[PDB]
Design an enzyme around this catalytic site. Structure first.
Site, mmCIF file in Angstrom:
data_model
loop_
_atom_site.group_PDB
_atom_site.id
_atom_site.type_symbol
_atom_site.label_atom_id
_atom_site.label_comp_id
_atom_site.label_asym_id
_atom_site.label_seq_id
_atom_site.Cartn_x
_atom_site.Cartn_y
_atom_site.Cartn_z
ATOM 1 N N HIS A 33 -37.291 43.661 -22.903
ATOM 2 C CA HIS A 33 -36.534 43.923 -24.114
ATOM 3 C C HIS A 33 -36.951 45.242 -24.771
ATOM 4 C CE1 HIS A 33 -39.897 41.658 -26.057
ATOM 5 N NE2 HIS A 33 -39.702 42.564 -27.000
ATOM 6 N N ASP A 63 -38.090 38.857 -18.600
ATOM 7 C CA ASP A 63 -38.531 39.743 -19.660
ATOM 8 C C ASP A 63 -39.622 40.667 -19.198
ATOM 9 O OD1 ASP A 63 -38.663 41.180 -21.987
ATOM 10 O OD2 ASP A 63 -39.010 39.443 -23.321
ATOM 11 N N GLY A 139 -44.541 44.470 -32.652
ATOM 12 C CA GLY A 139 -45.322 45.586 -32.153
ATOM 13 C C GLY A 139 -46.149 45.122 -30.957
ATOM 14 N N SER A 141 -45.066 43.107 -28.550
ATOM 15 C CA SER A 141 -44.216 42.924 -27.358
ATOM 16 C C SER A 141 -44.706 43.740 -26.164
ATOM 17 C CB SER A 141 -42.768 43.325 -27.665
ATOM 18 O OG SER A 141 -42.035 42.241 -28.153
ATOM 19 N N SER A 156 -43.603 38.289 -24.719
ATOM 20 C CA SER A 156 -42.163 38.326 -24.929
ATOM 21 C C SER A 156 -41.755 38.052 -26.386
ATOM 22 C CB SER A 156 -41.459 37.355 -23.981
ATOM 23 O OG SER A 156 -40.064 37.279 -24.252
#
Lengths: 185, 51
Positions: A33, A63, A139, A141, A156
């Site tokens: 993402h 992801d 932040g 991720s 994720s």
């Protein structure tokens, strides 16, 4: 730069997952993402230090994403912060894990379930996720989930926060390594 | 930003900040919208970016 460090795209900030390689070509993994719709990645908010360009992206459903390094001088440590990573492994229920992210730093917990389905809405559904009781915040991720010297997953999303506690889902890193034919080092 | 499609059970955790009327910087739209719902529609958007 290493796992957990901040990475900036034209849109926002995420975290570097793991530094990986294929032969003599270096890349870094992060969340799909984050790579979705991103081309160039920088090491700082000023966007003066280039890291590389997006080479692959898989989200939703999965992801994970991969970025090819174009910066020839920046150190590409095969670690998470100071923690050396030597292999990858499959998550198991009850496994003690640790996550590092650019916003919240390092937090630990355990794997509470496998093969979870997470619906982020608007058709953004991800499958086969690792569920944990580790917190994470915006932040974080793409940051790494590891267990000792073993790479386990990529951050994720989830709910809650680090103050009140939360639930975070991770993409199994083994699947990303296999898809791109890369290895941790 | 429209929060009608909320709340959502989970949010991705990328950083693209929004500033709420409570002077709190929300990490992303999903986090902000879930908070709006949790406040029963009392929280509003002050401006985009950090507070």
């Amino acid at each position: 730069i290493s796992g957990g460090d901040a990475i900036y795209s034209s849109t926002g900030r995420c975290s570097l997952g793991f530094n990986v390689r294929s032969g003599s070509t270096y890349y870094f993994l992060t969340a799909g993402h984050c790579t979705d719709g991103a081309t160039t990645w920088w090491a700082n908010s000023a966007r003066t230090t280039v890291l590389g360009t997006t080479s692959g992206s898989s989200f939703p459903n999965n992801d994970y994403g991969i970025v090819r390094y174009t910066n020839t001088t920046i150190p590409k440590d095969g670690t998470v912060g100071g923690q050396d990573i030597t292999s990858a492994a499959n998550a198991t229920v009850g496994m003690a894990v640790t996550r590092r992210g650019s916003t919240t730093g390092t937090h630990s917990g355990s794997v509470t379930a496998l093969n979870a389905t997470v619906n982020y809405g608007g058709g953004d559904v991800v499958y086969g996720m690792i569920r944990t009781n580790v917190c994470a915040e915006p932040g974080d991720s793409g940051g790494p989930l590891y267990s000792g010297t073993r790479a386990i997953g990529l951050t994720s999303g989830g709910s809650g926060n680090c103050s009140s506690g939360g639930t975070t889902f991770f993409q199994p890193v083994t699947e990303a390594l296999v898809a791109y034919g890369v290895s941790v080092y | 930003v429209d929060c009608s499609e909320y709340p959502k059970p989970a949010c991705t955790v990328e950083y693209r900040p929004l500033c709420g009327s409570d002077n709190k910087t929300y990490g992303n739209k999903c986090n902000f919208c879930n908070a709006v719902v949790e406040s029963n529609g009392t929280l509003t958007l002050s401006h985009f970016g950090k507070c």
